[PDB]
Structure formats: structure tokens, C-alpha cells
Amino acid sequence: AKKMIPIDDDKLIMEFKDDATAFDGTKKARFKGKGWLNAQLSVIFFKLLEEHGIKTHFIGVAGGNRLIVEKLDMYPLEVVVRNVVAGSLKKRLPLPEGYELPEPIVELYYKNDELHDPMINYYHAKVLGISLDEIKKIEEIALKVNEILKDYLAKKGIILVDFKLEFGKDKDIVLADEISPDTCRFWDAKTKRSLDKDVFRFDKGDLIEAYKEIYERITGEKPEF
Amino acid sequence: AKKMIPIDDDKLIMEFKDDATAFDGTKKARFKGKGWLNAQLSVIFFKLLEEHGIKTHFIGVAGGNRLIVEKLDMYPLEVVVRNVVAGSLKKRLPLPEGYELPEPIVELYYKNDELHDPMINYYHAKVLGISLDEIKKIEEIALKVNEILKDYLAKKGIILVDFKLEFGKDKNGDIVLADEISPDTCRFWDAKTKRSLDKDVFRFDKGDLIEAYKEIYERITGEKP
Amino acid sequence: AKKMIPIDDDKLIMEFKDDATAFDGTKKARFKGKGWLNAQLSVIFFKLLEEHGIKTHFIGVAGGNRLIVEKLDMYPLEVVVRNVVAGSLKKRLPLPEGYELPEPIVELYYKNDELHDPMINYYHAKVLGISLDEIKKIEEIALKVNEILKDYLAKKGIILVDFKLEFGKDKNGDIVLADEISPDTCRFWDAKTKRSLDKDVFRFDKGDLIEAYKEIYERITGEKP
Amino acid sequence: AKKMIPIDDDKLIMEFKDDATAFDGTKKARFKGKGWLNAQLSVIFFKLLEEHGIKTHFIGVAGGNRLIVEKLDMYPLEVVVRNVVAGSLKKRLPLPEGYELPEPIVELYYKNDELHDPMINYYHAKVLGISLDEIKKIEEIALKVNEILKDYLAKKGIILVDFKLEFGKDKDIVLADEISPDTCRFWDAKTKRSLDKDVFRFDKGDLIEAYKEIYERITGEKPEF
Amino acid sequence: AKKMIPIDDDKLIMEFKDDATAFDGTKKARFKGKGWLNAQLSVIFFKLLEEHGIKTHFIGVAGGNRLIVEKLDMYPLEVVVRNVVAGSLKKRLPLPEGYELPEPIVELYYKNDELHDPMINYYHAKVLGISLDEIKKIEEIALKVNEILKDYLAKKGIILVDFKLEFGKDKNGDIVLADEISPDTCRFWDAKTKRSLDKDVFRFDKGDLIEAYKEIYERITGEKP
Amino acid sequence: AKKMIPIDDDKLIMEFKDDATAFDGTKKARFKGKGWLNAQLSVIFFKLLEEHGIKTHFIGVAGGNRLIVEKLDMYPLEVVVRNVVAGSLKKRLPLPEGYELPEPIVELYYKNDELHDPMINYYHAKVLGISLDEIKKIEEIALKVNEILKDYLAKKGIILVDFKLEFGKDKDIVLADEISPDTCRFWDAKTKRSLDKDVFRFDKGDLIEAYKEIYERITGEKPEF
């Protein structure tokens, strides 16, 4: 759903596609507009966070579905922040779906398609080369990012249930990858319906529909091109 | 394989049985002698650790397969310490079986038969009620225990690959090591051959269980049971 | 605007009045309903915070304008938390009115009518008897309280610009939030218009006080008093 | 009373004048010798501190009233250390003039003529770009400097009541500006009369008189040229 | 030179004698007045420190050469604080006699006549039962005491070169300064001449002991005994 | 027993000799093979530690008795780690020879032939220019190194009683000098006889004999050339 195209040593282009993928490829479809929407929600989000002094890889926009992003020495981590009990958190804690966590939970995953992204802790993280200090900073950034996204979305009747972040090191630790309904769980505050990729993962409705809603609610206008 | 029989408010009897169980009960057998051997290896281990000022629940022996143990407010934790890459750690790190970790790894499992003992971090731990301070103390005790057991077994040509501890709180608020310490709950490999001298022998039918446990016992005490 | 009536050693009555005071008494008026509204917004706030395990002095309600509150060893502090640049923070930082702070600011005031509540730091705090540990805890509680109030009001289109807390010590030695939490002690702005819905309306004659406080109440409870 | 004349990228000349200024310019005079005395007490002080491994901007002397000083990236801070209750500390704490503080007090001021140097804390300091770590180091240096100046002056019957410091960053945090009866409060130990700029601020005697005394008591000789 | 006479469980009498001892008893003499002077300088010092909230064992005076002191669980420590290079510190650092240390040095000695008071570190300290926390507190008290004694003596032209403290635990668990504080246990030099006004005068026959101690007393109290 | 021959700015040759020295030169002999054995046990040890990510000065082997070693800014420290009570530790603690320490002890010595390597603490260490942070890292490395050497030697029936380390700073803190029976105390686990330089220091047997034993027990082959 994303392709990374190198420019030079400092920067590259991140290209958002219309291809949507679930369950390791076994489920696939294409949604006209998804790429544009995802790139654009990413820009909105990265700029919002950068307003609060969050350092992000975002440099500029290169057309509707392409971002220009600074080049990074990437951590082999997928970091998940959770405000509301959903998905695999059910398999880990005795709490029903939708339960509001008293504090956000940070989970670390070793980014590794083959091991199917296994959860690790600080000891595994060290083995993979990430120091305790880096870890602590990564978690602190994530929770700072969690607070800004959650408060921002909540004012617009959107629940940030959870989301995934990636990070890398500039030549300082830097937030990377994307921030889109591909990588977050959003629920309508009133209804609790998904407005994210879960709609496609579990055929609970129209995907392009739900993503346009996010876009509409944030910008206050329908999606163009 | 263990039955807890209450006595009063301060203490209880832990009774080691000959029934052996794997894979949630779908694999079962009985090994004459296993109970006695497990109780006795536990006494040896608890007393050795208590020599180094490790607080344990062990009070005394009540016949060959029963231990008298102090009654605790138990942590809903299974704590795993790992010196050598084996088992599920292969699913978590890109490392072959038998690889010697540069430092020991500590993992936390939410003790819950239903969720099949899922792995948790400090954030999940708090949700379940365990403060960061208790966690830190639990991990430090576990690593202290890991060092005493590992050094001791290695002098006798035994590798402490990994092992599982449980803990509870006594009525001063002190954190206390509990459950058992036996070839049911540790991974021991012969140093020369790398064969298992633990429950793995029963789990995977790689030989005679009673045989491997007698070996542990023989190598430790120096006496053939 | 508040009168403290002692009951016994553990508890007292806090009574909210209709008398409103500004600029050390040189400006005064009476607003029919103000007392009832302030008592009631305080109950709402204390109970909301107590839902998140914030320890407060609130025990129960004793009629429309009286609260039953637990008796404390009070800190000679007024603690101010700030999300948005307003008031005297303009005199302290080169920032326009309405500027959104990237993080909340905590200020400490020595509670003393004579010195007209001067600002102090940790060093002054110690001189007055408050240890560095207590200070740290006070600021952490205040920031926790700031986050719960801010998120809650913002869902209802209300900006928590700033607010003042007081604290005291109960008879376990636990630090306890006290005084009141009302449009007398917070700065609330309508999110869309930025008008004041607090005492600033009375301080600077920018409208109808009873009107703005009823608004807070209406938006929160959803019921017109 | 000081003029900064640039040389190059690494260094500059600090020139001490005879012009004395109080209350933002509204009070002014000229004192023949003041510039010379101030430069010379600065040298004495900077060299004394540099004896104890305090890093200072002082490089050399360039004539009687000119110092050669290393160029710095300056903190927008005026940092005040206080041993004895005097001046505006009276407006902040319920203590009489002359009271000996049980510990020195450090106060931070935002250096800003327009806001008339307002007091800030660690949160304001961050907003202005100064990290908590820098702050902590700045305070630690100040208190180290406070101890050396206080002990040194006390042996010569002089009380270091308080004083102001400025700091900057070399290309390490470095003590800067000046250290003179313009920037410290000195009291005669026996009499409690001022031997500093307070003499000029409040017309309590002859300024050039009091400064010569400091010089005389320190060096053990009258002032030349 | 001191005899401890038990009274009861809370308190005892410390009695200062005229017998003076050096080099493990191989050098001995008697100085009429020494006991009285040592008891009295100790009272002065303990009361001065107790003015700054230093907890000491001093309860009251019981005649000219006896002190009433609170009974303690004593640390097997002699703790030495050093401002100026003298004695055995010459054997440890490449520094001439009289060199002024940039910071005070704290040394720990295992109090044991047999091993002739060997120097230990934190690791030896633990072996002997003293936790790292107690050690840290002991050193912080010692450095606080060092600063109060040093400043006080220096105003009177006396250099606190070094001195030895002992400590014990009272029955709240609070750490308490004990033994004595006298020219037997400190090194004092006249500021101008650098001659000794302490036991060094007796140790090395460099003058009249009773003479130097009377000097300390005279300079402090201002009264000739 | 070692000669340092410079190559260039990054590296040098460490040459192991057959000359053995004790008691500052007053005792000397030559042992054919000692140099070879010492170089070779050093290589074994440095490579073993470097397997665990311990940074060492070892670069390569240059013939049987010469090591190629990276050039360092050396700490003026001899750091001693002790597992078992022996030598001068007897003069510092009331414990018999051979007593197993409950935790390893780290001692610091100022490397200085003239002062005959005196013990220092953290305060002396600072005076000599070593910061508290460096010290803490040096001790942590030493204890990590202590654990790897001790466990490794214990499996082969050898007790690591104590040993000395030196460290320096690359252009990171780096383990340096040598690791040989010249710089460690080894005891046979069964007999408690020395297998180190103590054999030569106190004429308790054949030196070349004991060192060959270490070599034999480690490699599993007799010594060649």
C-alpha cells in the first residue's frame, strides 16, 4: 500500500497506492482514492505533530499521493499505543471490547514479516540492538504523539482506539512511516463503528466511505483529487 | 502435577504427584518416582537460594512428596528467565536453537490458562495491578536466582537453558519466591551432549523422563535413587 | 464566595455563596444562583476526578450550595496549570493571548493575601516547609487532573485555558486535592468563539456572569437550570 | 555600565564604564573609577572561580577597564542566588530583612528589559528553549560559585547577601557577564551597611567609597588606575 | 581519652580525660585541662550543628568534662572529611601538603584497632552490613557538617584541614552523629601561619598542646580559660 | 614482563617476556615459556569477552608472544575484582582466607609505582580527573567481565579468586593491559592450590607448571611454541 522510492542520501519519496492488503496477502482489493486519502491524512497528522515539536520524517508533498520524506536509519520496531481495548489486546488481558484503559498501553513488536511481527520487551529489544535509553525515548515520543492525536480526534467525535508508529534515527529519534486509517483504529464516538482498515479486514462496510468520513470530519470538506 | 492443600492462614502443603501433563491436557502419562524427585529437587533449590538470602515460600519437608510452604498473596505471573535460545524464543528473535544469550532475558506472562498464558509487558502488568516497583523487584530477584541456579548447575555439567518462577507477597509486604523449581519448570541440557534432562523429554518423546530426572538428582546430590 | 464551617476533626462544610469578589475586594457584586452553580460544578468535577482515582476532599453534598469535605493539613499553595497563554503568563513569556502551549505549564504561588499571592519556586517552597518530594507529587497530581479536566471539557467545545488547585494532607500522609473547581477558579473559553465562560466575565464586565456559568452547567449536564 | 565590542567569532572585549544606572534609566550618575574597579573585581572573581575549575568566559585583561572574553551562545537568563533575605525576596517570603537562609535560594529570571525581567520556573524555561538538564547544570554551577564567593568574602568580613549570574554555551555551559558590586549585594559583616550598588540606588552614602572598600579588603591595597 | 559510662537503654555519659595517646599507645602523656577543653569544644560544635538541624547524640552537659549522650546502634565507621591535603592523603594523591582541594573528600575507615582502621569503599561497607542508602546519607550528613564547621572556623582565622566523624542509629532508625568533635579529632591550622592547633602538636612535638587547644577555645568563645 | 612498542597513532604491539618480577624488583627470575603462555591466555580471554560484546584493546596476534593492541588514552587505574577473600583483603575485612564473598568486591587503585598503588575511592578518582560516570561504567564493565571469566573458569574446576584490570578511552571505555596468571588469582577448585603468580611470589611450587595447567585446562592441550 506504500512504495519507497529513493532520491539520494538525505531523502526519498513515499508513494501511497490504492492496493489494500490483509492477512499477509491472502485478502486483497483495490480502492480508488485510498492512496490519495492516506497520503493526505498523513500530511495533516505529521504537520499537526510537528506543530508540537514532534520530529517527523515529513519534508514535503510531491503530488496528491506522494510524500517527500527524510532518510532514516530505521528501528526494526512496530510500536503500538492503545487507549481502548480492541483486537489482540483481548488475548492478553481479561477485558471486553471497547473498555477504556485508565492509562495508554505501549506494546513493542519486532518488525519481521516472517516471524509475523512478534511482541518483544526491553530485553529482546536490546538483543536486536536497541538500548534502554532509545526505547525509553521511543515510548515517550509515542505517548506524546498519542496524546496529541487522541485529543485532536476526540473533539471531532472520533475515538483513537489504537495505532502503530515506526521510528528511525536521523544523522535524534524521528517518527516515520505513515499515520492513516491503515495504521490507526478510529471509532465514531457515538456509534462505535470503525472508520479505518477494520472495515476492509472484516467486510463491515465501504472502506473508501469510512476514510472519506475521517477526511471530511478533519478538514471539513469532502475528498477531491 | 502439584496439588495445594490449605492448612491455615500462614501455611499450606504442596503435594507433588506422578501425573505428568502437556499441551493443556491433551497429552498425559504417569511416571513412578516423578513426584518424589520434583519435591526433592525443589527442596534442594529453595534451600540453596535461601542460603544466599533469597526469600522463598519453603518452610519444611512433610514426607517424600509434600512440602510445607508459607501462604502468600500470589502475583498472577509466570516469570521466565532465559540464558540460551530455545522454544518460543525462536519465534521472537532471529536466533538458532542453542545460541548463548549475551545477557539473560526476563519475560512476563499473565498467568491465565484461558488466554493460554500470554506475554505481557510493564504496561499490561500495571493494568493487572502490579506496580512498576514490584515488577523491578521481581525481575531483580529472578535474575539473582538465575545466577545462583546457573552457576551451581554448570559446575555439574548442566546448562540452565531457561526456567519459570512464580512469586507472591507475604504479610510484611515482602516479595517471595513460590511454586516449584524442578525439571518440570526449567530447561536443563547436558553440557556435553545438549540432550534434555527435563520435561522436554516427555513433551516430545525424546527418551525416558524418569531417567533424565534421576540424572539431575544424581548429578546434584551424588547419590543414585 | 466560600465559607468554611468546621464540624469535627475529620470533616467540615464548605458553603458556596452568591457574593462575587475581584481585585482584593475593591470590586464586588452578588449573582443569584452563582453559589449553587459553583457547588454543583465542583461536585461534578471532584467525582469525575475521583473516578480516575484522584484523591479529593469531597465527601458528599449537603444541600444545593454546601459540600461536605474532609479535613486536611493544608499546603500554603495555590497551584496553577496552564494550557493556553492568558492573563499574567503574558507578563512572563513573549507570547500572544490564546497561544496553545506545547505542554502544560505548572506555577506555584505562595498563598498569602498580604504578599498578594507571589510566585515561588522549589527553593521558596522548601523554606515554607514543603519538601521536594511533596512538590513533585503535587505537580504530578495537578497535571493528571489537568489532563482529565481538559479532555472532558474539550469534548463539549470548552477550552480549559488555565485553573488553580489547592491541596492538603490527610491523616495517612496522602496528598489530597481540596478547595473548589468552578468557573471562579478556572479559565474556560468557548472553543468556537473564545469568549469567557468564567469569572473573567465579571472581572472585566464582558457580559452576564450567571449566563456564562449556566452555560458551563448546561453543556456539562445537558440540562437547563 | 558595560559595552560589548566584538572582535571575531571566538572572542570580544567587555568594556566597563563609569556610567551608573538605576530604575530603568530614570536615575543616572557617573562615578570616576567605577569602571576600573568593576573590571578589576570581575577579574579577581573569575580567576578565583577558575581556580576551582569553574569554566568562565574570561580570557584576559585589555587595560584597566576592558576584559577579553570568549564568545558565547547566551542563555536569556538572569540567575539569582541568595544567602540572606533582602530586596524583592521580602515580597515572596514572610521573613524580615537580614534573615540568614538555611540554604541558598536560586531564582530564575527571563532576561527581557520589556517584561522587566520576570521570574520564571522550569516550565517557562523549557518554553524559552532551555532543557531541564541545562537548567539543573546552571543551578548547580551557580551554587558552587555561590559557595566559593561566599566563603572567600566572609573571611574578609563581607556578607554575600545575593548576586546575579549569566551563562552561555561555548562551542559546555560557561559563566559570563560580570561579578562586581553592580551585580552582588555585599554587607559589612559587623555593621550590615551596603558595599554595593544599593548605596547608589538608595543614596545611602558614597558609591566609589563602598567599591574601593571591597577592593581594599580583597587585595589589601587602595585603588589605582 | 574518652570513657563511655552506661546509664540506661536510652542514654550514657561520655567522660573526657586528660590522658593523651598517639601511635597505638606507644606515645603517651597527660595534659591538665585537655579533658575539659575537649568536652567543651564538643558541646559548642554539637550545639552549633544542632542549630542547623543536624541530629547529634548530644543531650546535655554533666559537669566540665562529662557529656550526656543518647545511646545508639553504632556504625563500625570512622568517616573522614578533607578540605586540605595533609597526612595520609599525601600517600594517596600526587599533591603537596597544604593544597586546597577543589571539593571536600570523604573517606570511610573500618573502625577496627586490629586492622589499624583500614580504608574501605562502598563494597566493603555492604559486607560489614551498611547499605548503600545509609552510606549515601552518612556522606551527605558529613559534608553538611563539614560545611558548617568550615565556614564557622574560617571566620575566626581557623582552617578546618580535615576531621573524623562517627555515626549511629537511634531508635526511629534515624542516622545520628556521635563520638566527639575536638582538636583530638580534627585538623585545625591557623590561617595566617599554618601551624597546628590540634593533636598534631602532641603527635609530632611541634609545641604546647594545652596552648593550641586553649587557642581554639579562646578564638571561638572569646574568653581565656 | 610486558613491553609496549608503538606502531602509530591507532595501534601498538604488546610484547610478553619471560622475566618475572615481585616485590618491586627485589625478587626476580626468568621462566622459559611464561611470555608465550601469558600472551596466549590473554588472547583466549580477550576473545571470549569480545564474544559477549565487551570492548577490548585486542586487535590481533603478532607471533607467539606479541599482541597487536589498539592505542588508548589510559586511565591511571588498577581495578581489582574479588570473589574470594585473599591477600590484602584480609587486612581490610575480618574474614579468613578462602571465604566466598556474597557479592564481588570492586577496589580502585591509583596506578602509581611511587605511591606503591594506593587504594582510592570515587572522590580521589575525581581529583585525578575521572568523572563519577566513567567510574560507574568502569565498575560495571569489570563486574560483567568478572562474571564471564568466573563462570568460564569454574566449569573447568578453576576458582577466579580475584584479578586486576586496566582501562582506557578509544577515540568509549576499553579494557586493556593483560589477563593472565600474572594478573589473576586462580585456585584449583578441589585443592585450593594456586595456579597463578602467587606460586612465584611465595615459592609454593613450579610457576611454568601452574601456568601450563591453566592453559591445558582451558584449551585441552599441552603448551607448544
From Swiss-Prot, chains A, D, F:
Q: Which InterPro entries match?
A: SAICAR_synt/ADE2_N (IPR028923), SAICAR_synt_PurC (IPR033934), SAICAR_synth (IPR001636), SAICAR_synthetase (IPR050089), SAICAR_synthetase_CS (IPR018236)
Which reactions are catalysed by this chain? 5-amino-1-(5-phospho-D-ribosyl)imidazole-4-carboxylate + L-aspartate + ATP = (2S)-2-[5-amino-1-(5-phospho-beta-D-ribosyl)imidazole-4-carboxamido]succinate + ADP + phosphate + 2 H(+)
The processes (GO biological process) annotated in the record are: 'de novo' IMP biosynthetic process; cobalamin biosynthetic process
Keyword flag Ribosomal protein = no
Has UniProt tagged this entry with the keyword DNA-binding? no
- Pathway the protein acts in: Purine metabolism; IMP biosynthesis via de novo pathway; 5-amino-1-(5-phospho-D-ribosyl)imidazole-4-carboxamide from 5-amino-1-(5-phospho-D-ribosyl)imidazole-4-carboxylate: step 1/2
Which Gene3D superfamilies does its entry note?
ATP-grasp fold, B domain (3.30.470.20), Phosphorylase Kinase, domain 1 (3.30.200.20)
Gene Ontology MF: a single term = ATP binding
Task: Keywords in alphabetical order, please.
Answer: ATP-binding, Ligase, Nucleotide-binding, Purine biosynthesis
User: Any idea of its EC number?
Assistant: 6.3.2.6
Query: What EC class is this?
Result: ligase
Q: Which family does it belong to?
A: Belongs to the SAICAR synthetase family.
Indicate what this protein is called per its UniProt record: Phosphoribosylaminoimidazole-succinocarboxamide synthase
Instruction: Please give the organism.
Output: Pyrococcus horikoshii (strain ATCC 700860 / DSM 12428 / JCM 9974 / NBRC 100139 / OT-3)
**Source organism lineage?**
Archaea, Methanobacteriati, Methanobacteriota, Thermococci, Thermococcales
